[PDB]
From Swiss-Prot, chain B:
Originating organism: Thermus thermophilus (strain ATCC 27634 / DSM 579 / HB8)
Residue ranges that the Swiss-Prot or TrEMBL entry lists as coiled coil: none
Protein name (database record): V-type ATP synthase subunit E
Protein role: Produces ATP from ADP in the presence of a proton gradient across the membrane.
Gene name of this polypeptide: atpE
First-to-last residue of the parent protein present: 2 to 63 of 188
Entry similarity comment: Belongs to the V-ATPase E subunit family.
Length: 60, 62
């Protein structure tokens, strides 16, 4: 019974570990793509303020 | 005879003392086996939950 409960709790918490680990990591992937898209889409409309500034400060 | 019955008493007394000593021994044996198995089971929740928590630590950091 000691070996059986050891093996059963092992398989139980490794199922738990596997499922919750992949459910966490895919959600972090989703939120990471959302954050990258959000900062790029905020920067695109924000652009062309920059290029005139850098071309003004490089040129005399 | 008297010592007929007394030697029968001696055999019964030695058997009864033998089985009382054996009762005390068997009770201590089931006590020590149960204590060892429950020390095992108390250590295994540490040895498994600590692994699970450290896994979630490094997964969250990653």
């Amino acid at each position: 019974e000691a070996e059986a409960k050891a093996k059963a709790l092992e398989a139980q918490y490794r199922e738990r570990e596997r499922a919750e680990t992949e459910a966490l990591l895919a959600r972090y992937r989703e939120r990471a793509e959302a954050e990258a898209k959000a900062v790029r889409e905020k920067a695109m409309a924000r652009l062309d303020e920059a290029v005139a500034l850098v071309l003004k400060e490089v040129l005399p | 005879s008297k010592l007929e019955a007394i030697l029968s008493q001696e055999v019964e007394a030695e058997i009864q003392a033998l089985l009382q000593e054996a009762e005390a021994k068997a009770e201590a044996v089931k006590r020590e086996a149960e204590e060892k198995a429950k020390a095992l089971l108390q250590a295994r929740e540490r040895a498994l939950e600590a692994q699970y928590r450290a896994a979630l630590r490094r997964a969250e950091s990653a």
